């Protein structure tokens, strides 16, 4: 039967690209019905409207477009309210779209609760600023357990913990400590540890060696963006946030792009591929596989959006995929 997914179209290109995914999901005749909520901030005591929370709490699956950043970030409010603690970014090379890196196929799993997010920053005396971050024993264990769980289910064979335990001796030491615990209980997956800089050094040189990477949020999404740089950028990268209660919201990392907002120039590839992720999380694999293949095929051919150097339009690009899916 049809399952229902909370849709949060974003701002700028957000509604436009949301529209495009729905159109393709329709051409794909996939058992999905979109319960649209447009959530904006309300109250400090900031919160998302109850109607949006309950929608997400019920459906468990969210798909969202880019959100303008204005008090507390909406993204922040979402993360906190559904306890999204695992960020997944699978970076795989695109056959139609040539970059200096072609062999790329990685999943970056990052802690999504602490580090930068839990940070407090303040002035100590004039011209001296101090930054405060934290890592907990509980949260490192959780993300590690997720990392191996994701590797096992998604037919992945290696998990690498990325740390900087030379400098963050205590914090990254505790992170490794938990990753080791979990590796002991999950010997199906080959586990190693690397320093962040060596990973970056090697990533640039030969990303083919890496499979699945797990890390804490002391450094943010810098490394995942490094990987996105490898496969053509933020226009084509799916993102997923998995939380407590079986909630999972899939999103696009690329910004709003307001200067282009009208005229449907925008590239809906990233959001679409995120939905493909969503379909697989749901277990609608056939549908995920078809929509994905159509999207890859459409790019390989060239009907390309301007950012991909096509002169084609969002509608056409969407239209072209739609047409392909039907066969």
């Amino acid at each position: 039967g049809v399952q229902t997914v909370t849709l949060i179209p974003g701002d700028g290109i957000g509604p436009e690209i949301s529209a495009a995914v729905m159109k393709i999901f329709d051409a794909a005749k996939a058992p999905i019905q979109w319960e649209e909520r447009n959530v904006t901030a309300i109250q400090g005591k900031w919160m998302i409207p109850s109607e949006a929370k309950e929608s997400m709490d019920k459906n468990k699956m969210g798909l969202k477009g880019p959100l303008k950043t204005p008090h507390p970030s909406m993204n922040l409010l979402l993360r906190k309210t559904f306890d999204l603690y695992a960020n997944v970014r699978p970076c795989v090379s695109i056959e139609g779209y040539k970059t200096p890196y072609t062999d790329v196929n990685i999943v970056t799993i990052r802690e999504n609760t602490e580090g930068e997010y839990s940070g407090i920053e303040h002035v100590i005396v004039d011209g001296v600023v101090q930054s405060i971050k934290l890592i907990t024993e509980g949260a490192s264990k959780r993300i590690a357990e997720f990392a191996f769980e994701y590797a096992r289910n998604n037919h992945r064979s290696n998990v690498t913990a990325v740390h900087k335990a030379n400098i963050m001796r205590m914090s990254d030491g505790l992170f490794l400590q938990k990753c080791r615990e979990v590796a002991e209980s999950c010997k199906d997956i080959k586990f190693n540890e690397m320093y962040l800089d060596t990973v970056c050094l090697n990533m640039v040189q030969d990303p083919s060696q890496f499979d699945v990477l797990v890390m804490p949020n002391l450094y943010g999404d810098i490394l995942s963006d490094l990987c996105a740089g490898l496969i053509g950028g933020l226009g084509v990268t799916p993102s997923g946030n998995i939380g407590a209660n079986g909630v999972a919201i899939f999103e696009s990392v690329h910004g709003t792009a307001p200067d282009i907002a009208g005229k449907d120039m925008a590239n809906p590839t990233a959001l679409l591929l995120s939905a493909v992720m969503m379909l697989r999380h749901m277990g609608l694999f056939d549908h995920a596989a078809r929509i994905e293949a159509a999207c890859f095929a459409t790019i390989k051919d060239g009907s390309l959006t301007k950012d991909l150097g096509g002169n084609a339009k969002c509608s056409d690009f969407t239209e072209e995929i739609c047409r392909r899916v039907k066969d």
Binding site: T99, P100, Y101, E116, G119, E121, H122, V123, I124, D126, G127, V128, V129, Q130, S131, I132, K133, L134, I135, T136, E137, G138, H163, K164, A165, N166, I167, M168, R169, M170, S171, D172, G173, L174, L176, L196, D197, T198, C200, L201, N202, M203, V204, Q205, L218, Y219, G220, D221, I222, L223, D225, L226, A228, G229, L230, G233, L234
Partner: protein, 335 residues
Amino acid sequence: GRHTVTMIPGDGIGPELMLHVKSVFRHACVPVDFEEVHVSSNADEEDIRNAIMAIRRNRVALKGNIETNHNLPPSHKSRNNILRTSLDLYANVIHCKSLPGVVTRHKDIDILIVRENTEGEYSSLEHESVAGVVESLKIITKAKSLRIAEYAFKLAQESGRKKVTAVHKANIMKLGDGLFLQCCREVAARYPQITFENMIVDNTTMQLVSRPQQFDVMVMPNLYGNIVNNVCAGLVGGPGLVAGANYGHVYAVFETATRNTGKSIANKNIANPTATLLASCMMLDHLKLHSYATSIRKAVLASMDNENMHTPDIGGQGTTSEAIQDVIRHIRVIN
């Protein structure tokens, strides 16, 4: 009229490469004397305090890399990082320039990365005052952000480069990186001939992979764990090619851009010497021995044009000694 400089063999491929520096130096007739000081892997500080006293005496040092152990107690702070803070070597400079001989995915790269080297991650203070919760406390200051920015622009101006790019995370860390970014702006005013731009570190990593030719000089605070340094090393060929330097008001310490000791390849006569050699060249320029440095540097770059002299790390099949042999060959020609 010979200089005396401290040499630190260090661990891994360090010592063996240091011997090749000596032999090259003797053959180039360079007026330098190396006063060796060792740093092992015991807890006892005096191993590291002795080197301080030695470097304070000579004011210039060349070193290999010290083995790091992230399984030791938090009381055991990094030897190399103690060395930098104690001697106040605030400016870390790394030149990531493409080598014509070395084949990579990107060409025409010429980046001067200047990084704060006394605060930020070196100031880190961790405590577990409640069981299972580790908190960290970093510091960034106006005084140290100005000097590193003052150094970059001065290096930019004197090197004849056009642009300095500040790399930060001031979108997330309003107060900290915002202060650094503002300290760079204050300096930018006194250097009208230099173009000043800034960029988020997230975006900077992505650009490096796609279009690294856009970067000229880069200045940054000591955060993000040398992501930029290593991405750029990987870009031009790897850790065997890039040299690093640490400048203070008084002292100066020269080394490879990487901290890798190369334990697995040590004593096998296969390590790439060019990183250490170019570092020794930078050391010679600092000692005002500009003729000797140009001779050695040119010899290194020339032998690198030949793929037969390449070592296994960059795909070649030559040995270290064989590489040094061709280096010395080019020096004897121009003499």
